[PDB]
RNA sequence: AACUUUACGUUGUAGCUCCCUUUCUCGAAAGAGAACCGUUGCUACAAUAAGGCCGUCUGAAAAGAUGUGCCGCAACGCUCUGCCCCUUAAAGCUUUAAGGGGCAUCGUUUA
DNA sequence: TAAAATCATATGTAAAGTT
DNA sequence: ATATGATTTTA
């Protein structure tokens, strides 16, 4: 078994890992295995919405439609019973036969006349169906609702129906809303008033069925809709005292040597003041700039304290959170003796599931769950690791908004950098080479420092700015004791002045403690200088937490890192030094060590760089930090000229072992660093011979655990999902392969127009439309926003055109909407593969074929449609079944191709595969589109572990069912 | 992360309706009448994943009534189930048995 | 040709609230 | 990203 350190680089859609041996004193000595794990991040890629959004909106809509349908069913039953309809009015399907299709006009007429049973029924069903809007600043629909309400009772109109007809047919031509207008909505209260008024009139005129029974049934149906909805409710004495106290007890003051909570007398002074006084934070230190506290319940009742008690306060808190109305709240309060809500919350060898109560971001939950997968795979394979080193990406834990904000920020800063480099080139025309980062930064610091050597105030000649050994960008506070590479820690000073500083802060160097003249001049310099406030603050740090600062800069206090260190240190058997065995690297320090150790990247081409930073942070042990700190300290105050401790004049960074970058880059990429267009060593034989080959002096790089990197991917072998696309097209013409869809005029372009159904039936319409689209250079949304009519054979305009039909090609459907419509398909959960006569046959299995349980009986032939497709019987040998991201290999004479199954072409009978790391030196983004299967020799799906180990073929027996 | 409703949109079928291709009759032609389609606009009813169910009342079952009726595009996991893989051990490739893991058509959220 | 590789185009949406 | 009509290239 091994003593090893497992490094992890965690992303939103990838987890890279590596294992590095340690010697007894925890130096890096050897590298074993390394891997990547990719999946799909837990959100919709392009719109940032949740993954369950589609499912919940589907649920909401399903329930809405079934509840409305059921409402109408109950209304028909009620009609039949209270005596309006006999059994001759209804037909076989329980649908009232012979309905008047003229309900609005009947409503208006219905307040002057005795109506026969059928039209009374029609209006009643009409009101139940479209039942208006209920209560449950700005407006869009609410504006239209309120406008019609105002018109209806702050005007001369009788009633909503009548009003609607005249007003909406006088200046719109259409009663109902269309295409996202909301002005013709109605308040349910106004529909209710219209209903009662109609009942009065039908009572008056002698309508037979205007009974109390029908009135209650109909009215209740119209108005009734479901009302919106031992753990601790928060607005309770027990909960607010706790939120006050437990969040108070971790407030720390930076003391002389350590941090300290407030003294028992200090905490006592203001424990009871949020009780005794209404308010605070800025006045927390005024007694002992955000809020940080307010006692909501106690002070709400006050606004001389109040005289209540906990048992009563606990009961009123519970009663107000479980109930909303006056009704039940008074009940429990009445026995016991304002608005409340928002209830309160209340070692092995492997890692237990990530607590979804503790972790409530889906992206982070998925990333950490695959992190746990990788961790347990590594453990079961190699035994318990000594240390777990974690480096989690910057975008982990952030909202979609925040991620986008940062994406924006980095584009504008890249534009800025190009502009600044242009200025620098203009300043330095004869500059041999191109601007590097430190040169541009030297220019910025010159401008920022006012062209003054911030340590001496000497004017800096710009001509010599980029002279080797004239100006140097400095670590104001030194790097040995603080590990600060940050931009606020850098000031541009001459080389003449920065040679006797040592590793001293300016306050220990300019004798700031005796407030000497040099310190006064210096503080003035940086104060007036163009640096931000943060920079000025850190340049003049007087005394600080040496150990605190270094720990701060090596450790990430992000929530996910905090929790992850805590959860992997508490609930996991780690063979490490008991003090602190999990480590969350700082982003900038990991970046520094990668860039200084030779793995400065190739900027996202293939999917294996995650292993790079996993390796870089695996190696950040305390012994390595020792070595780096000694080296940096030395170089800080020279001492690199003939001397010795316990010192050659050209010593660069203490890398873990000699030839770190070479070995690591070979193993991770199979090619030597600097040469990414080599011949990849995709075998053990090539990789091991290349490691014994290229690396002469390192025979410790060839052992029995050297395996090439094969990225593992998320297996999504679900058999549920979307049934069909939500655009329903007519199937009347599906005999010949077409289907007609009403395309609205505002969004039909030339290509859509050419397929217009009546192109040979209104050459004047076709011609006007073609003419107009060509006239406006077809941008239809603007080109048809001017009402366009239908001119006669020899005459004036007659009829508006608001949408026109278009026939589109179709050879597949999904018969939806009661076999009345055909829709497109969307999800191919599976592809069953058969082999007869050394030929390979593909059988797509979709997700409606699963809902019905259809096991398809037909394979795919190119060009021929489903009715002329090869049938599959008992003569076909079963091979395997492919789901998305199933590792498959296909061998033919041309090539051998090995990857993850991604697509199956329905038309062409081909399948597409992704490469393991989606590389662009192969295919289209590493997706291999269009692969032969019928003419090939070998076709078999394999296995994959999360690590990449244990890749072995598959043979299946009995063909599985679809349900 | 759940939950109520609304208003559209799409498909189907009706009544009216703006255009119009062919086919039958009347006419010398000019024009008319019609039919089956296609389809512009308006209104209404049915459906609004594909698929599966419940409960209450008369009933002897038949079978009829009835409901603020219900689930179905996700995350995670291994208590149960299915597949696949890995070990381990015994006998003549399977069997038995024990164990472990990956993923789901399995389980919880969830009705 | 038949199969394999390539290219190319279409995917439902606003509102109002509640816990 | 998926699904799939339509088109070109190849044994």
Q: Which residue is nearest to nucleotide B9 (CA to C1')?
A: A179
Residues 6+ apart with CB under 8 A from A435: A421, A424, A425, A428
Query: What is the C-alpha separation between A529 and A449, in angstroms, rounded?
Result: 5
Estimate the share of chain A in helix, then strand, then coil, as percent rounded to the nearest 5. 40, 15, 50
Distance A956 CA to B66 C1' (A): 52
Distance A272 CA to B2 C1' (A): 38
Query: What is the C-alpha separation between A330 and A337, in angstroms, rounded?
Result: 10
CB A148 within 8 A of CB A185: yes
Query: Which residue is associated with the tokens 């179709």?
Result: A810
Residues A811 and A833 grouped into a single domain: no
Residues A800 and A850 grouped into a single domain: no
Instruction: Note whether residue A549 is domain-resident.
Output: no
Whether the beta carbon of A228 falls within 7 A of nucleic chain C: the reply is: yes
Instruction: Note whether residue A790 is domain-resident.
Output: yes
Distance A754 CA to C1 C1' (A): 32
Q: Please give residues of chain A from 936 to 955 whose alpha-adjacent beta carbon (CB) lies under 7 Å from any atom of strand C.
A: 936
Distance A52 CA to B110 C1' (A): 14
Distance A103 CA to B42 C1' (A): 13
Nominal resolution (angstroms): 3.3
Q: What phi and psi, each to the nearest 5 degrees, are found at residue A833?
A: -115, 130
Sign of CA dihedral A139, A142, A148, A152: negative
Instruction: Note whether residue A67 is domain-resident.
Output: no
Q: A511 is written with which tokens?
A: 């004798």
Instruction: Note whether residue A201 is domain-resident.
Output: yes
Query: What is the C-alpha separation between A685 and A393, in angstroms, rounded?
Result: 34
Q: A199 is written with which tokens?
A: 């009942």
Instruction: Note whether residue A200 is domain-resident.
Output: yes
Q: A2 is written with which tokens?
A: 């091994």
Phi/psi region, residue A394 (left: phi>0; alpha: psi -120 to 50; beta: rest), is alpha
Q: Are strands A387-392 and A4-10 parallel, antiparallel or unpaired?
A: parallel
CB A471 within 8 A of CB A460: yes
Read out DSSP for A653-673? ---SSSSHHHHHHHHHHSS-T
Phi/psi region, residue A226 (left: phi>0; alpha: psi -120 to 50; beta: rest), is beta
Q: How many other C-beta atoms are found inside a 10 Å radius of the C-beta of residue A573?
A: 12
Distance A446 CA to B78 C1' (A): 63
Q: Which residue is nearest to nucleotide B2 (CA to C1')?
A: A56
Strands (E), A242-334: 253-254, 259-260
Q: What residues approach strand D to within 7 A at the CB? A: A 45, 809-812, 824-828, 844, 884, 894, 902-908
Residues A199 and A259 grouped into a single domain: no
Instruction: Note whether residue A770 is domain-resident.
Output: yes
Q: A148 is written with which tokens?
A: 């019609």
- How many domains would you assign to chain A? 5
Write down which residue in A524, A544, A564 finishes a domain.
A544
Residues A809 and A841 grouped into a single domain: no
Length of chain A measured in residues: 963
Distance A909 CA to C1 C1' (A): 17
CA atoms within 13 A on the CB side of A961: 4
- Measured torsion, CA atoms of residues A234, A240, A245, A250, in degrees rounded to the nearest 10: 50
Q: Please give residues of chain A from 220 to 249 whose alpha-adjacent beta carbon (CB) lies under 7 Å from any atom of strand B.
A: 224-229
Q: Which residue is nearest to nucleotide C4 (CA to C1')?
A: A932
Query: What is the C-alpha separation between A617 and A138, in angstroms, rounded?
Result: 52
DSSP structure class, residue A200: H
Query: What is the C-alpha separation between A242 and A405, in angstroms, rounded?
Result: 36
Instruction: Note whether residue A788 is domain-resident.
Output: yes
Residues 6+ apart with CB under 8 A from A153: A190
Residues A200 and A88 grouped into a single domain: yes
Query: What is the C-alpha separation between A590 and A593, in angstroms, rounded?
Result: 5
- Measured torsion, CA atoms of residues A65, A68, A73, A76, in degrees rounded to the nearest 10: -140
Distance A321 CA to B24 C1' (A): 79
Distance A178 CA to B16 C1' (A): 20
CB A922 within 8 A of CB A910: no
Residues A802 and A900 grouped into a single domain: no
Distance A829 CA to B80 C1' (A): 25
Query: What is the C-alpha separation between A711 and A35, in angstroms, rounded?
Result: 7
How many secondary structure helices (H) and strands (E) does chain A include?
31, 23
Residues A313 and A255 grouped into a single domain: yes
Distance A200 CA to B5 C1' (A): 28
Distance A851 CA to B105 C1' (A): 11
Element (H, E) at A267: helix A264-271
Give the Å distances, CA to CA, from A523 to A520, A535, A774. 5, 12, 71
CB A650 within 8 A of CB A52: no
- Measured torsion, CA atoms of residues A253, A256, A262, A266, in degrees rounded to the nearest 10: -120
CB A120 within 8 A of CB A100: no
Residues A769 and A843 grouped into a single domain: no
Q: How many other C-beta atoms are found inside a 10 Å radius of the C-beta of residue A225?
A: 12
SS3 A486: coil
Q: Please give residues of chain A from 357 to 396 whose alpha-adjacent beta carbon (CB) lies under 7 Å from any atom of strand B.
A: 362, 365-366, 369, 372-373, 376-377, 380
Distance A218 CA to B66 C1' (A): 16
Whether the beta carbon of A797 falls within 7 A of nucleic chain B: the reply is: no
Looking at strand D, which nucleotides approach a protein CB closer than 7 A?
A: 1-7, 11
SS3 A339: coil
Write down which residue in A521, A544, A567 finishes a domain.
A544
Nucleotide nearest to A51 (CA to C1'): B74
Q: Are strands A877-882 and A471-475 parallel, antiparallel or unpaired?
A: unpaired
CB A97 within 8 A of CB A90: yes
CB A473 within 8 A of CB A438: yes
Instruction: Note whether residue A890 is domain-resident.
Output: yes
Whether the beta carbon of A933 falls within 7 A of nucleic chain C: the reply is: yes
- Measured torsion, CA atoms of residues A436, A437, A443, A446, in degrees rounded to the nearest 10: -140
Residues A187 and A249 grouped into a single domain: no
Whether the beta carbon of A399 falls within 7 A of nucleic chain B: the reply is: no
SS3 A924: strand
CB A187 within 8 A of CB A132: yes
Least Cα distance to A364 among A336, A402, A332 occurs for: A402
Q: A467 is written with which tokens?
A: 């002279």
Looking at strand C, which nucleotides approach a protein CB closer than 7 A?
A: 2-8, 10-19
Strands (E), A218-368: 253-254, 259-260
Query: What is the C-alpha separation between A729 and A808, in angstroms, rounded?
Result: 9
Sign of CA dihedral A92, A98, A104, A108: negative
**CA angle at A52 for the pair A46 and A56, rounded to the nearest 5°:** 120
Distance A759 CA to B36 C1' (A): 20
Range of A511's domain?
Answer: 447-544
Whether the beta carbon of A910 falls within 7 A of nucleic chain C: the reply is: yes
Query: What is the C-alpha separation between A109 and A100, in angstroms, rounded?
Result: 14
Q: Please give residues of chain A from 288 to 327 whose alpha-adjacent beta carbon (CB) lies under 7 Å from any atom of strand C.
A: 324
Residues A851 and A910 grouped into a single domain: yes
Query: What is the C-alpha separation between A82 and A24, in angstroms, rounded?
Result: 91
Distance A235 CA to B53 C1' (A): 42
Distance A225 CA to B74 C1' (A): 27
Residues A291 and A205 grouped into a single domain: no
Write down which residue in A336, A363, A398 finishes a domain.
A336
Distance A816 CA to B46 C1' (A): 14
Sign of CA dihedral A480, A485, A491, A497: positive
SS3 A446: helix
Read out DSSP for A810-871? -S---EETTTTEEE------EEEEEEETTEEEEEEE-SHHHHS-----B---SS--GGGSPB
Element (H, E) at A615: helix A609-618
Sign of CA dihedral A230, A234, A235, A238: positive
Looking at strand B, which nucleotides approach a protein CB closer than 7 A?
A: 1-15, 17-21, 38-52, 65-78, 82-86, 100-105, 111
Nucleotide nearest to A178 (CA to C1'): B8
Distance A187 CA to C18 C1' (A): 19
SS3 A37: strand
Q: A711 is written with which tokens?
A: 């990225």
Whether the beta carbon of A934 falls within 7 A of nucleic chain C: the reply is: yes
Residues A851 and A786 grouped into a single domain: no
CB A259 within 8 A of CB A544: no
Nucleotide nearest to A862 (CA to C1'): C3
Whether the beta carbon of A744 falls within 7 A of nucleic chain C: the reply is: no
Nucleotide nearest to A94 (CA to C1'): B46
Distance A104 CA to B41 C1' (A): 18
Query: What is the C-alpha separation between A104 and A122, in angstroms, rounded?
Result: 10
Q: Please give residues of chain A from 491 to 520 whose alpha-adjacent beta carbon (CB) lies under 7 Å from any atom of strand B.
A: none
SS3 A250: coil
């Amino acid at each position: 078994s091994i003593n090893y350190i497992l490094g992890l680089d965690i992303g939103i859609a990838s987890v890279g890992w590596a294992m590095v041996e340690i010697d007894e004193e925890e130096n890096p000595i050897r590298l074993i295995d390394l891997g990547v794990r990719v999946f799909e991040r837990a959100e919709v890629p392009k719109t940032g919405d949740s993954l369950a959004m589609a499912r919940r909106l589907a649920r909401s809509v399903r329930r809405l439609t079934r509840r409305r349908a059921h409402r109408l069913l109950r209304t028909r039953r009620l009609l039949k019973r209270e005596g309006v309809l006999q059994a001759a009015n209804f037909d076989e399907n329980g649908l009232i036969k012979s309905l008047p299709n003229t309900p609005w006009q009947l409503r208006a007429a219905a307040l002057d006349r005795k109506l026969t049973p059928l039209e009374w029924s029609a209006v009643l069903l009409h009101l139940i169906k479209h039942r208006g809007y209920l209560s449950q600043e700005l407006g869009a629909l609410l504006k239209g609702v309120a406008g019609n309400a105002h018109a209806l009772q702050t005007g001369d109109f009788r009633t909503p129906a009548e009003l609607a007809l005249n007003k909406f047919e006088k200046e719109s031509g259409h009663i109902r809303n269309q295409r996202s207008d909301y002005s013709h909505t109605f308040s349910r209260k106004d529909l209710q008033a219209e209903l009662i008024l109609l009942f009065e009139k039908q009572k008056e005129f002698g309508n037979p069925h205007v009974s109390g029974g029908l009135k209650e049934g109909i009215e209740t149906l119209l108005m009734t809709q479901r009302p919106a909805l031992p753990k601790a409710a928060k607005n309770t004495y027990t909960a607010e005292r706790f939120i006050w106290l437990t969040k108070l007890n971790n407030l720390r003051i930076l003391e002389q040597g350590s941090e300290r909570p407030l003294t028992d007398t200090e905490r006592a002074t203001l424990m009871d003041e949020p009780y005794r006084k209404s308010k605070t934070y800025a006045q927390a230190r005024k007694l002992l700039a955000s809020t940080l506290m307010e006692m909501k319940a106690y002070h709400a009742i006050s606004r001389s304290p109040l005289n209540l008690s906990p048992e009563l306060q606990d009961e009123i808190g519970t009663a107000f959170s479980l109930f909303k109305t006056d009704e039940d709240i008074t009940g429990r309060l009445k026995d016991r003796i304002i608005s409340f809500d928002k209830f309160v919350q209340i070692e092995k060898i492997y890692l237990p599931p990530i607590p979804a109560d503790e972790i409530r971001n889906p992206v982070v939950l998925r990333a950490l769950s695959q992190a746990r997968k990788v961790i347990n795979g590594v453990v079961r394979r190699y035994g318990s690791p000594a240390r777990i080193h974690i480096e989690t990406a910057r975008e982990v834990g952030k909202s979609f908004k925040d991620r986008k904000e940062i994406e924006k920020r980095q584009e504008e800063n890249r534009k800025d950098r190009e502009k600044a480099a242009a200025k620098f080139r203009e300043y330095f025309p004869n500059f041999v080479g191109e601007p590097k980062s430190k040169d541009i930064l030297k220019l910025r610091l010159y401008e920022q420092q006012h062209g003054k050597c911030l340590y001496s105030g000497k004017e800096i000649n710009l001509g010599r700015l980029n002279e080797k050994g004239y100006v140097e960008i400095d670590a104001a506070l030194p790097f040995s004791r603080t590990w600060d590479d940050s931009f606020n820690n850098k000031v541009l000073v001459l080389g003449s002045e920065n040679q006797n500083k040592g590793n001293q802060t300016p306050y220990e160097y300019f004798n700031g403690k005796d407030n000497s003249r040099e310190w006064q001049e210096f503080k003035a310099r940086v104060e007036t200088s163009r640096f931000p406030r943060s920079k000025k603050q850190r340049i003049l740090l007087q005394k600080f937490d040496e150990d605190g600062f270094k720990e701060r800069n090596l450790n990430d206090t992000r929530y996910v890192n905090r929790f992850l260190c805590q959860f992997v240190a508490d609930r996991m058997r780690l063979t490490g030094k008991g003090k602190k065995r999990v480590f969350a690297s700082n982003g900038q320090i990991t970046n520094l060590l990668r860039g200084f150790w030779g793995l400065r990247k190739v900027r996202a081409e293939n999917d294996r760089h995650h292993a790079l930073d996993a390796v870089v942070v695996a190696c950040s042990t305390v012994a390595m930090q020792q070595k780096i700190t000694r080296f940096v300290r030395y170089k800080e105050m020279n001492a690199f000229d003939g001397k010795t401790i316990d010192l050659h004049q050209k010593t660069h960074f203490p890398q873990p072992w000699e030839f770190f970058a070479q070995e690591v880059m070979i193993r991770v990429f199979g090619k030597p660093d600097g040469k990414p267009e080599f011949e990849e060593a995709d075998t053990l034989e090539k990789l091991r011979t290349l490691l014994a080959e290229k690396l002469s002096s390192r025979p410790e790089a060839v052992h029995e655990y050297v395996t090439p990197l094969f990225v593992s991917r998320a297996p999504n072998r679900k058999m549920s999902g979307q049934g069909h696309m939500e655009t329903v097209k007519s199937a009347k013409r599906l005999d010949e392969g077409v289907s007609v869809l009403r395309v609205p005029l505002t969004q039909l372009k030339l290509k859509d127009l050419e397929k217009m159904v009546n192109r040979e039936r209104e050459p004047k319409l076709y011609e006007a439309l073609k003419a107009r689209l060509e006239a406006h250079k077809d941008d239809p949304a603007k080109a048809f926003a001017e009402p366009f009519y239908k001119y006669d054979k020899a005459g004036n305009r007659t009829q508006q055109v608001k949408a026109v039909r278009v026939e589109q090609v179709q050879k597949t459907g999904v018969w939806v909407r009661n076999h009345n419509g055909i829709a497109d398909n969307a999800t191919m959960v599976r592809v069953d593969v058969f082999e007869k006569g050394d030929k390979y046959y593909l059988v797509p299995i979709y997700s409606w074929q699963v809902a019905k349980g259809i096991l398809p009986d037909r394979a795919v032939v190119q060009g021929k449609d489903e009715e002329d497709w090869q049938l599959i019987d008992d003569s076909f040998n079963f091979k395997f079944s492919l789901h998305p991201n199933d590792l498959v290999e296909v061998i033919t004479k041309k090539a051998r191709m090995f990857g993850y199954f991604a697509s199956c072409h329905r038309g062409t009978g081909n399948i597409n595969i992704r490469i393991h790391d989606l590389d662009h030196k192969i295919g289209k983004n590493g997706i291999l589109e269009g692969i032969g299967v019928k003419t090939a020799l070998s076709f078999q799906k394999y296995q994959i572990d999360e690590l990449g180990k244990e890749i072995r073929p598959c043979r299946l027996k009995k063909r599985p069912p679809v349900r």
